[PDB]
């Protein structure tokens, strides 16, 4: 992906790596549901 | 380093550079692609007319405490339903359902929500062809 | 005045062959082996830098 380093800073946020893990799981669910 | 292109025959690359980095400012994009005129329920107008359906109250944001009086309004151009704030002390009692009412912008940053009631972009101006300022001061009556 | 015009640090030499007594002009920073043009002995042997003179130096031009 494009990554903005601003997001790595941990004030007010959960850790970016785990957010990246969450984003891919949602993408796989959406993509499977359509049937590709 | 030094700014490019600065040559004497580099006339069109400069134009391209400008035309490319001028799509990053929303003021040009939203005017050339006509997005406001597309998502606007007023069809690009300063005022509009509608009919009242429901009288309601909204909470003021923090750290303020108050109820702001509003009404739902179904427009006559397009049939879209919006929300409008009733200004003045007691302006909600001079209103009723099925009354026709004229709607202006409320006044705010970027033609938007003003002060401590977000979610409301519009304001009532006239009730059945009479003005709220007069109805609230006590100088005219609602027919 | 200042060091504006670069001048070469290498000089040409006039030397005399210790075998046959021939006299000959050579370079002092050779990249090839230098030999006598009569008997064929070695006069200067090359190095990375200044060559090592195996003869007698008569003059420095």
């Amino acid at each position: 992906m494009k990554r903005r380093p601003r997001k790595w800073k941990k004030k007010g946020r959960m850790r970016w790596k785990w957010i990246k893990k969450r984003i891919r799981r949602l993408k796989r669910q959406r993509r499977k549901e359509r049937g590709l | 380093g030094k700014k490019a292109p600065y040559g004497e025959f580099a006339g069109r690359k400069l134009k391209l550079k400008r035309k490319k980095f001028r799509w990053s400012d929303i003021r040009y994009k939203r005017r050339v692609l006509r997005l406001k005129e597309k998502s606007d329920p007023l069809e690009g107008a300063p005022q509009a007319r509608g009919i009242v359906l429901e009288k309601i109250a909204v909470e003021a944001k923090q750290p303020n405490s108050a109820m702001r009086k509003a009404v739902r309004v179904q427009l006559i151009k397009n049939g879209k339903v919006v929300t409008a704030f009733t200004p003045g002390d007691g302006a909600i009692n001079h209103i009723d359902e099925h009354d026709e009412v004229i709607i202006e912008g409320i006044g705010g940053p970027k033609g938007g929500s003003m002060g401590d009631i977000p979610g409301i972009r519009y304001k009532v101006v006239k009730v059945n062809r009479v003005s709220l300022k007069e109805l609230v001061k006590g100088r005219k009556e609602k027919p | 005045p200042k060091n504006l015009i670069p001048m070469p640090r290498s000089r040409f030499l006039r030397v005399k062959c210790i075998d046959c007594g021939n006299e000959q002009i050579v370079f002092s920073h050779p990249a090839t082996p230098v030999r006598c043009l009569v008997c064929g002995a070695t006069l200067v042997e090359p190095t990375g830098g200044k060559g090592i003179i195996k003869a007698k130096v008569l003059e420095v031009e």
Binding site: - | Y6, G7, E8 | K2, L4, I5
Partner: protein, 129 residues
């Protein structure tokens, strides 16, 4: 790489003046550079420039006297008529007669005052003050 020796010369002059030097050596010489130095001498910004000869090109040796604030080359070399000089004056100089625009005409390199007196235009190459 090396594109314009005139700009290099003029910037070297500005820096050496700003720091307080007496003499200045300009390695890649030309004829434009000589003509520009000639104009600057006539107007009184330098002293006693001479050409030295090595086998590559010329070198120029210049003396400074403390009468320079700024100096530089104008890029791109704009064409200019005998009717639009005040614009570039206001753009490159701080007062109405303060410094010299150096112009290249079909009659030689000159100052814009001379060019205007003769009634001609040309191309802009440098400014000094």
């Amino acid at each position: 790489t090396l594109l314009d020796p005139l700009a290099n010369a003029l910037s070297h002059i500005t820096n050496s003046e700003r720091v307080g030097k007496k003499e200045v050596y300009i390695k890649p010489a030309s004829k434009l550079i000589g003509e520009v130095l000639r104009v600057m001498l006539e107007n009184g910004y330098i002293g006693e420039f001479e050409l030295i000869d090595d086998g590559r090109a010329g070198i120029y040796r210049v003396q400074l006297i403390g009468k320079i604030n700024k100096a530089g080359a104008i890029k791109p070399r704009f064409p200019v008529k005998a009717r639009d000089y005040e614009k570039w004056e206001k753009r490159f100089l701080p007062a109405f007669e303060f410094g010299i625009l150096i112009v290249s005409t079909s009659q030689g390199v000159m100052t814009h005052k001379e060019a205007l007196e003769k009634g001609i235009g040309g191309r802009l190459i440098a400014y000094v003050y």
